[PDB]
Ligand binder design. Structure first.
Ligand code: HEM
Ligand code: HEM
Ligand SMILES: Cc1cc(N)nc(C[C@@H]2CNC[C@@H]2NCCNCCc2cccc(F)c2)c1
Ligand SMILES: Cc1cc(N)nc(C[C@@H]2CNC[C@@H]2NCCNCCc2cccc(F)c2)c1
Ligand SMILES: C[C@H](O)[C@H](O)[C@H]1CNc2nc(N)[nH]c(=O)c2N1
Ligand SMILES: C[C@H](O)[C@H](O)[C@H]1CNc2nc(N)[nH]c(=O)c2N1
Ligand SMILES: [Zn+2]
Lengths: 403, 401
């Protein structure tokens, strides 16, 4: 075989070689001495990143080496020469946004990558206007439960000028209220953002599922607080298909997963606000959000209702309750006619995507620890699939909280 | 320099300083991570010196007379012969350290408790067999399982290796059928076929224990049947599901890995089988539910009368849990040592804390440490891990055929 990583599927016995990794222009955290694959967090410069991106764009429309390609390159360097930055054409932004999704190693939903609605909000000049754009995104994306993948792109970062930022990590989040006894009512993931919303004058609720308002920041201004109109935020009360008491627990989740604190980098340009959204894989809600010990932590409650023996690990009470909670999430979203995908169907699709990308680009960057679902890992085909992880650009990158 | 390591459930942070002790590169580079992939005198002398330094350090006698004179002996033997030999107590220390150092093992809380049988005076396949039988008897201990390793003679420059051809001491046959399907364990079709070719008369069951193919240097391997009385097995039944027992399922008590190489101070032990006890997910999830193994999920789901037509009924998940529960209940009933994945991962977290204090870190392979079901329900899911190769070490080796 070739001087490229060999990649094996242990269920099927099939082999591929990843040649796409040669295109990686950015170092990850691993070295020959030690693997750090499981850690959650990681003039001339701009111009070479820009050239690379324009080359990618022209290769994607099959015009590599043409005068249009050469003219665009010249236009970009003259823009940078005199202004220090450059700007993307509308179709370049569209291509770049889809490519950043395609390149995201942690996303199992990439079979959908070519179907992304790209809203261009590069004309936005105020917090109020960000709010309008965001409500529009939410309405389009939710589409009354027939969810449509989308991204809204606000103005890029500029030399010595402040950033557009959405302070919330998602467009929809539940409040976390720190109680006097030290415990938390609502989502403990969101204690800090809830605390900041109150400081900026939000009148807080007192429930387990209170939708947070948005803190939105335009360049060089304090952030401004905006409450989402409730009719815009689609939620799904959770019930179980056979266990009738489950509805009585008053659990719920929102329909729209919309990540809003990631930086979108395209050709050296940095879009510090570019919230994007798809639809849920059910285990995100049923396993992580509801059962993580540092989240809603409902496993014991549900096991008590199912009358399990919670005093001993070998009864597998945690496993049994987790399964029924995950089943409840699927059933309820299906009943409410809100788009959702189970972990079996999602991982099958990702395997198909792997085959697609092998043919199209000669590999696919994938982070095995994130792609493998948090329940039933080896019951899904991705557990048996070796994966190579590397950074490609355009990319979504985590960015530090602005506060 | 030193990697920051965070637990996302508790918010606690440590720094791994142990990784600086690594002398051997893994498969990753800054360009790409390959963490999910499954697979002369001076050089030997420095590995040997280092191991001896490790040894005298462990008994708190660094720089003592015994330490200086032992370094002399090693040097003299290598200068003269190009190799050397370990003393029994050194071998015992090195075997425990290789277990301690093994990144894919969730059972390492037990690392200091290991019975070491010195079999380096073995000169024939027949002798290998007696040693293996004794190991099995000792480790099994009527179901009260005890960790053990038996170390056969080291590799030598001149000649072929002592090798056990079987990947474990106890495996079930896999019989390829006219229709290309497999009866028994599909993971074992090749070794089954080798046994038949070396004169084994095969059974035709789903759980026929394989004979051993044992190899002394530069000889054809030899076939030995394990006396059935030595091989402890557990019939599988379910606490509430009566029909489960009638699936006729069983597994053997003793997990005993026999194809790995044990490397201690530059010396290589190509046959050095080791055994502990099972974590129940290995049997319940991987061996019985992998599609390329016994693949029983669908049969069981139908017995449970689940809706098999659609993934979103979570029929696979439901069936998998009940199979795992059956494994645990049946081992507990038969009074055979077993540990569930919640208990094992909780003890592994304790091991991590013990090692931080003892050594400043612990090499761990997240993809192998997190169990194949209910991953995020265990504490190890939320624990970042640093992977690297320390020596003494267990390592994979090519099949001898
Ligand atoms: C179409 C339906 C989609 C599904 C089912 C899906 C699925 C997932 C899942 C399960 C994760 C892991 C999330 C976690 O545990 O935190 C993830 C992460 C991610 N997804 Fe997708 N996704 C979808 C759409 C999208 C879209 C439209 C984008 C961007 C255009 C996207 C980009 C990403 C990125 C950048 C991550 C990593 C986020 C992080 O590091 O926190 N996904 N996705
Ligand atoms: C005492 C009870 C033990 C438990 C519960 C345990 C648990 C486990 C588990 C679950 C794995 C992953 C297995 C797989 O999926 O193939 C593993 C791997 C491993 N264990 Fe332990 N183990 C135990 C004893 C031992 C002992 C005594 C040794 C050596 C002296 C050992 C050395 C290893 C090694 C080298 C691996 C990686 C094997 C490979 O690469 O295939 N273990 N162990
Ligand atoms: C510290 C840090 C780093 C990082 N990369 N990330 C985070 C957000 C964490 C990751 N894990 C839980 C939480 N993120 C939860 C929100 N993720 C939904 C992803 C999703 C699903 C479907 C469609 C979409 F468009 C997006 C934190
Ligand atoms: C190709 C390859 C490489 C490698 N390093 N390894 C393998 C054996 C595979 C790994 N995964 C399934 C199968 N190994 C069989 C399971 N091994 C039992 C581990 C164990 C458990 C409890 C106590 C013990 F002492 C030992 C294959
Ligand atoms: C420590 C570990 O890397 C961390 O808990 C990861 C594991 N895999 C994950 N996978 C997904 N999809 N989402 C996550 O938040 C995590 N958390
Ligand atoms: C491709 C992937 O690395 C492979 O399926 C691994 C995943 N994790 C594992 N974990 C354990 N404990 N045992 C295994 O055999 C595997 N297989
Ligand atoms: Zn790595």
């Amino acid at each position: 075989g070739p001087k490229f990583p060999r990649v094996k599927n242990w269920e099927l016995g099939s082999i591929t070689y990843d040649t796409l990794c040669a295109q990686s222009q950015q170092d990850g955290p691993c070295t020959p001495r030690r693997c750090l694959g499981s850690l959650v967090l990681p003039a001339e410069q701009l111009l070479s990143q820009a050239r690379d991106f324009i080359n990618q764009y022209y290769s994607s429309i099959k015009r590599s080496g043409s005068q249009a390609h050469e003219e665009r390159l010249q236009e970009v360097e003259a823009e940078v020469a005199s202004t220090g930055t450059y700007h993307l054409r509308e179709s370049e932004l569209v291509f770049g946004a889809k490519q950043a999704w395609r390149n995201a190693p942690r996303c199992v939903g990439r079979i959908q990558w070519g179907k992304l609605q790209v809203f261009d909000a590069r004309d936005c000049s105020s917090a109020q206007e960000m709010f309008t754009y965001i409500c529009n995104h939410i309405k389009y994306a939710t589409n009354r439960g027939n969810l449509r993948s989308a991204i809204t792109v606000f103005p890029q970062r500029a030399p010595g000028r402040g950033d557009f930022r959405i302070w919330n990590s998602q467009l929809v989040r539940y409040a976390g209220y720190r109680q006097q006894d030290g415990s938390v009512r609502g989502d403990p993931a969101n204690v800090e953002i809830t605390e900041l919303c109150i400081q900026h004058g939000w009148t807080p609720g007192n429930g387990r599922f209170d939708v947070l308002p948005l803190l939105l920041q335009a360049p060089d201004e304090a952030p401004e607080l905006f409450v989402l109109p409730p009719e815009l935020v689609l939620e799904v009360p959770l019930e179980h298909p056979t266990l009738e008491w489950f509805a009585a627990l008053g659990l719920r989740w929102y329909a729209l997963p919309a990540v809003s604190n990631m930086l979108l980098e395209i050709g050296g340009l940095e879009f510090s606000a570019a919230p994007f959204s798809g639809w849920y894989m059910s285990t995100e809600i049923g396993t992580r959000n509801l059962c993580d010990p540092h989240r809603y932590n409902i496993l014991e409650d549900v096991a008590v209702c199912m009358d399990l023996d919670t005093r001993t690990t070998s009864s597998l009470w945690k496993d049994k309750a987790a399964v029924e909670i995950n089943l409840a999430v699927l059933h309820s979203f299906q009943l409410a006619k809100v788009t959702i995908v189970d972990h079996h169907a999602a991982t099958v699709s990702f395997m198909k995507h792997l085959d697609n990308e092998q043919k199209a680009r000669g590999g696919c960057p994938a982070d095995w620890a994130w792609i493998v679902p948090p329940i039933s890992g080896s019951l899904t085909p991705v557990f048996h699939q070796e994966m190579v992880n590397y950074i490609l650009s355009p990319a979504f990158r985590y960015q530090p909280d602005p506060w």
